[PDB]
Design a protein around this motif. Structure first.
Motif, PDB file in Angstrom:
ATOM      1  N   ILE A   1      10.727  32.691  55.413  1.00 12.76           N
ATOM      2  CA  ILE A   1       9.791  33.532  54.827  1.00 12.76           C
ATOM      3  C   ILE A   1       8.517  32.805  54.788  1.00 12.76           C
TER       4      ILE A   1
ATOM      5  N   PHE B   1       3.999  41.612  57.957  1.00 20.54           N
ATOM      6  CA  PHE B   1       3.775  42.795  57.170  1.00 20.54           C
ATOM      7  C   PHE B   1       2.587  42.162  56.160  1.00 20.54           C
TER       8      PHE B   1
ATOM      9  N   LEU C   1       8.109  47.224  62.076  1.00 18.45           N
ATOM     10  CA  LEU C   1       9.089  46.016  61.714  1.00 18.45           C
ATOM     11  C   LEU C   1      10.065  46.136  62.939  1.00 18.45           C
TER      12      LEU C   1
ATOM     13  N   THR D   1      13.926  45.984  64.067  1.00 14.37           N
ATOM     14  CA  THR D   1      15.002  46.054  63.545  1.00 14.37           C
ATOM     15  C   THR D   1      15.856  45.101  64.468  1.00 14.37           C
TER      16      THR D   1
ATOM     17  N   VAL E   1       5.659  48.040  53.267  1.00 13.74           N
ATOM     18  CA  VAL E   1       6.679  47.128  52.507  1.00 13.74           C
ATOM     19  C   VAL E   1       5.877  47.224  51.096  1.00 13.74           C
TER      20      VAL E   1
ATOM     21  N   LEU F   1      11.170  42.950  47.326  1.00 15.91           N
ATOM     22  CA  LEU F   1      10.349  43.858  48.402  1.00 15.91           C
ATOM     23  C   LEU F   1      11.137  44.813  48.686  1.00 15.91           C
TER      24      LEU F   1
ATOM     25  N   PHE G   1      13.035  52.432  56.460  1.00 10.97           N
ATOM     26  CA  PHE G   1      12.616  52.394  57.948  1.00 10.97           C
ATOM     27  C   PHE G   1      13.953  53.103  58.457  1.00 10.97           C
TER      28      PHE G   1
ATOM     29  N   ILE H   1      18.284  34.637  47.654  1.00 14.58           N
ATOM     30  CA  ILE H   1      17.629  35.872  48.398  1.00 14.58           C
ATOM     31  C   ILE H   1      19.006  37.204  48.256  1.00 14.58           C
TER      32      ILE H   1
ATOM     33  N   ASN I   1      19.776  40.707  49.730  1.00 10.78           N
ATOM     34  CA  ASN I   1      19.269  41.754  50.787  1.00 10.78           C
ATOM     35  C   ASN I   1      20.289  42.842  50.746  1.00 10.78           C
TER      36      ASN I   1
ATOM     37  N   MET J   1      20.981  46.869  52.301  1.00  7.90           N
ATOM     38  CA  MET J   1      20.437  48.042  53.045  1.00  7.90           C
ATOM     39  C   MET J   1      21.331  49.074  52.889  1.00  7.90           C
TER      40      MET J   1
ATOM     41  N   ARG K   1      23.775  41.444  51.822  1.00  7.09           N
ATOM     42  CA  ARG K   1      23.666  39.967  52.247  1.00  7.09           C
ATOM     43  C   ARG K   1      23.190  39.106  50.980  1.00  7.09           C
TER      44      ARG K   1
ATOM     45  N   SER L   1      22.058  35.307  50.319  1.00  8.98           N
ATOM     46  CA  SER L   1      21.600  33.953  51.016  1.00  8.98           C
ATOM     47  C   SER L   1      20.997  32.910  49.800  1.00  8.98           C
TER      48      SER L   1
HETATM   49  C1  LIG Z   1      15.965  44.280  60.041  1.00  9.97           C
HETATM   50  C2  LIG Z   1      14.673  44.792  59.831  1.00  9.97           C
HETATM   51  C3  LIG Z   1      13.838  44.111  59.022  1.00  9.97           C
HETATM   52  C4  LIG Z   1      14.276  44.207  57.656  1.00  9.97           C
HETATM   53  C5  LIG Z   1      13.126  44.702  56.535  1.00  9.97           C
HETATM   54  C6  LIG Z   1      12.722  43.728  55.678  1.00  9.97           C
HETATM   55  C7  LIG Z   1      11.196  43.565  55.019  1.00  9.97           C
HETATM   56  C8  LIG Z   1      10.859  42.925  53.776  1.00  9.97           C
HETATM   57  C9  LIG Z   1      11.830  41.750  53.642  1.00  9.97           C
HETATM   58  C10 LIG Z   1      11.429  40.289  54.323  1.00  9.97           C
HETATM   59  C11 LIG Z   1      12.128  39.054  53.844  1.00  9.97           C
HETATM   60  C12 LIG Z   1      13.748  39.261  53.917  1.00  9.97           C
HETATM   61  C13 LIG Z   1      14.645  38.100  53.796  1.00  9.97           C
HETATM   62  C14 LIG Z   1      16.117  38.767  53.484  1.00  9.97           C
HETATM   63  C15 LIG Z   1      17.126  37.650  53.563  1.00  9.97           C
HETATM   64  C16 LIG Z   1      18.270  37.892  54.519  1.00  9.97           C
HETATM   65  O1  LIG Z   1      18.061  37.601  55.733  1.00  9.97           O
HETATM   66  O2  LIG Z   1      19.128  38.515  54.110  1.00  9.97           O
END
Ligand SMILES: CCCCCCCCCCCCCCCC(=O)O
Ligand SMILES: CCCCCCCCCCCCCCCC(=O)O
Length: 129
Positions: free
Chosen positions: A41, A63, A71, A73, A83, A91, A95, A109, A111, A113, A122, A124
């Motif tokens: 990032i 973004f 984005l 995906t 975002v 963040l 979507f 980090i 994440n 979803m 996830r 990390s």
């Molecule tokens: C898979 C589609 C995109 C996902 C949407 C993420 C948009 C904002 C987050 C940006 C940084 C992502 C860091 C997450 C760390 C990870 O990979 O688990």
């Protein structure tokens, strides 16, 4: 630059169920399931760039917080969305009906979803620079 850096996936929950739901080809599921992927990032104020690498599969995204973005995906589908920041460390976006929270605490980090009742999480950790 608060979010900036290099991270590797340590652990994930519900990879397979989630990927099946969003339509990820069964092949990339079976290969990608144990991959500890790398996300880089780069933040500059409101502007972000982020790369997700999973051996050979490189997804580059960008973004600005508060603005429209497109984005790419996991399937290759690009969706227009926004975002936003939540608190000092989150963040947040939506979507294709997936709710996404990206949370940074120090060097970890998180994440998550969520698509309907499916929660793809996830964790990390930072891996240098
Ligand atoms: C898979 C589609 C995109 C996902 C949407 C993420 C948009 C904002 C987050 C940006 C940084 C992502 C860091 C997450 C760390 C990870 O990979 O688990
Ligand atoms: C050799 C090709 C690699 C295997 C196929 C890649 C399948 C995806 C692996 C999981 C990547 C993580 C996707 C969510 C990350 C995020 O957007 O926050």
């Amino acid at each position: 630059s608060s979010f900036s850096g290099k991270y590797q996936l340590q652990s994930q929950e519900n990879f397979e169920a989630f990927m099946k739901a969003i339509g990820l080809p069964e092949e990339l599921i079976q290969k990608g399931k144990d991959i500890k992927g790398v996300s880089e990032i780069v933040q500059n104020g409101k502007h972000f760039k982020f790369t997700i690498t999973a051996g050979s599969k490189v997804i580059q995204n960008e973004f600005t917080v508060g603005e429209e973005c497109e984005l790419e995906t996991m399937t290759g589908e690009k969706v227009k969305t926004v975002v936003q920041l939540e608190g000092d460390n989150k963040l947040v976006t939506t979507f294709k009906n997936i709710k996404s929270v990206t949370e940074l605490n120090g060097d970890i980090i998180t994440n998550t979803m969520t698509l309907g009742d499916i929660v793809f999480k996830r964790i990390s950790k930072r891996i240098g620079t």
